[PDB]
Swiss-Prot record, chain B:
Task of the protein: Probable ATP-dependent zinc metallopeptidase.
Localization terms from the record: Plastid, Chloroplast thylakoid membrane
Shown part of the complete sequence: 337 to 384 of 1008
Naturally occurring in which organism (per UniProt): Arabidopsis thaliana (Mouse-ear cress)
Entry's induction text: By high light.
Family per similarity comment: In the N-terminal section; belongs to the AAA ATPase family.
Name of the protein: ATP-dependent zinc metalloprotease FTSH 12, chloroplastic
Curated annotation (Swiss-Prot), chain C:
Subunit organization: Homooligomer. Interacts with FtsHi2.
Gene expressing this chain: FTSHI4
Knockout or disruption consequences: Embryo defective. Impaired plastid biogenesis and thylakoid differentiation in embryo. Defects in the photosystem II protein complex formation.
Location(s) in or outside the cell: Plastid, Chloroplast thylakoid membrane
Name of this chain's protein: Probable inactive ATP-dependent zinc metalloprotease FTSHI 4, chloroplastic
Tissue-by-tissue expression: Ubiquitous but preferentially expressed in young leaves.
Function: Functions in chloroplast biogenesis and chloroplast division. Required for plastid development during embryogenesis. Might be involved in chaperone functions or play a structural role in the thylakoid FtsH complex.
UniProt similarity note: Belongs to the AAA ATPase family.
Coiled coil regions, renumbered to chain: none
């Protein structure tokens, strides 16, 4: 057909123009002087370009079509954008504790995956009653996330520069806090997930290990992770502010969950809560 | 000379290892240093 | 103010020119156009100290 030949000529012309534009961009030494003028911020090409991928995958998961890599990228976007970006923004050099806490946060959140895969077939959601899982208003969830961001940026702002913070025998307490946090959280998770038949359907009342010290141990362990984090860059003020905001939201969800399982269980969790009154921190609250 | 930059020249290299530096000529460096436009000269240990 | 900004723009132009010449050299050498020239010469007989 003649129109096919005409369109082939047009495609050849526009491809010639595009290839010529690309070639005269490349072999021009001045575009090489100006486009290699942006390599100084090759650290800042990645840390923001990945955020668009993270939010795009977040929207895709909100629709309901997310592979494992995209959800991993969602939590990675949150966690990296939390830990590494603010001190890199404030001092321009990242060396030391922010790296290892970026590792530690991912090592922390990949703990429901292993427990819910070992004693299970795969990561697919199962069928259960709708009333079992406690929900909480969306504005409060967004407020929790925003407060966590605010406290982390304020922690990086408040803390001294990464070379002024001491080492030696003062960095050994930080390791102690890290290890005790991950022990308590893993014990709490292993004790909670052992007694549930479905994904979250508790058959009985758990009162073992971290449950005989604190009624809500996973929550306390998570906050203690942020407390050790605010101790790492030496910013106690942010530690106190996350104490306030995390305590407020997390106590709200704890009250909702507790009233649900007191209604659904009765005297057992009643005498258990009589045994351990201290709800989040040992004999502080 | 009471500049607060007493020894803040090499640890900059050590910290911002992940930056980029392009190549500069020699006789340009000599002619540029003769007119005193350089306030920092940081050597490599092996004179290369 | 305009004098100081003029000096700033002029030294900017100088540095732009010298890295532009650097990129021009390292680009034009790779197409064989600088072959036989001083920047990309050819091997010949050696030379002694004297
Ligand atoms: C790799 C992960 C991405 C690291 C992202 C870190 C980052 O964005 O930091 C920017 C700072 C420099 O900014 P400026 O104040 O120098 O303009 O630049 C840095 O400090 C980057 C350090 C990059 C480490 C490699």
């Amino acid at each position: 057909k003649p129109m096919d030949v005409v369109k082939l000529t047009l495609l050849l012309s526009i491809l010639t123009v595009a290839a010529k534009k690309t070639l005269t961009l490349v072999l021009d030494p001045f575009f090489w002087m100006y486009f290699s003028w942006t390599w100084l911020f090759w650290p800042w090409f990645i840390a923001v370009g990945l955020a668009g991928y993270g939010i795009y995958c977040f929207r895709k998961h909100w629709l309901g079509e997310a592979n494992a890599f995209e959800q991993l990228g969602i939590v990675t976007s949150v966690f990296t954008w939390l830990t590494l970006v603010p001190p890199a923004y404030f001092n321009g050099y990242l060396e030391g504790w922010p790296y290892v806490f970026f590792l530690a946060y991912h090592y922390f959140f990949f703990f429901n995956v292993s427990v819910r895969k070992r004693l299970y077939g795969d990561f697919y959601a199962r069928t259960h009653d709708p009333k079992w899982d406690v929900n909480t208003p969306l504005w409060s969830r967004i407020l929790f996330g925003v407060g966590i961001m605010v406290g982390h940026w304020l922690a990086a702002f408040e803390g001294p520069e990464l070379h002024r913070l001491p080492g030696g025998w003062a960095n050994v307490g930080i390791w102690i806090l890290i290890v005790i946090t991950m022990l308590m959280h893993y014990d709490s998770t292993l004790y909670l997930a052992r007694y549930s038949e479905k994904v979250v359907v508790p058959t009985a009342v758990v009162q073992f290990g971290p449950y005989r010290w604190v009624r809500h141990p996973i929550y306390a362990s998570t906050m203690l992770l942020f407390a050790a984090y605010c101790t790492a860059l030496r910013a106690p003020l942010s530690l106190l502010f996350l104490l306030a905001v995390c305590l407020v939201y997390y106590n709200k969800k704890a009250k909702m969950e507790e009233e649900l399982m007191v209604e659904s269980f009765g005297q057992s969790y009643s005498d258990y809560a009589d045994k351990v009154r201290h709800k989040f921190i040992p004999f502080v609250y | 000379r009471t500049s607060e930059t007493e020894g803040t020249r090499a640890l900059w290299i050590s910290k911002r290892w992940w930056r980029y530096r392009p190549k500069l000529p020699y006789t340009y460096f000599l002619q540029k240093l003769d007119s005193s436009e350089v306030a920092a000269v940081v050597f490599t240990e092996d004179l290369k | 103010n305009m004098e100081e900004l003029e000096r700033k723009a002029n030294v900017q132009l100088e540095r732009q020119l010298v890295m532009a010449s650097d990129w021009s050299r390292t680009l034009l050498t790779m197409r064989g156009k600088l072959k036989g020239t001083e920047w990309d010469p050819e091997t010949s007989h050696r030379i002694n100290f004297s």
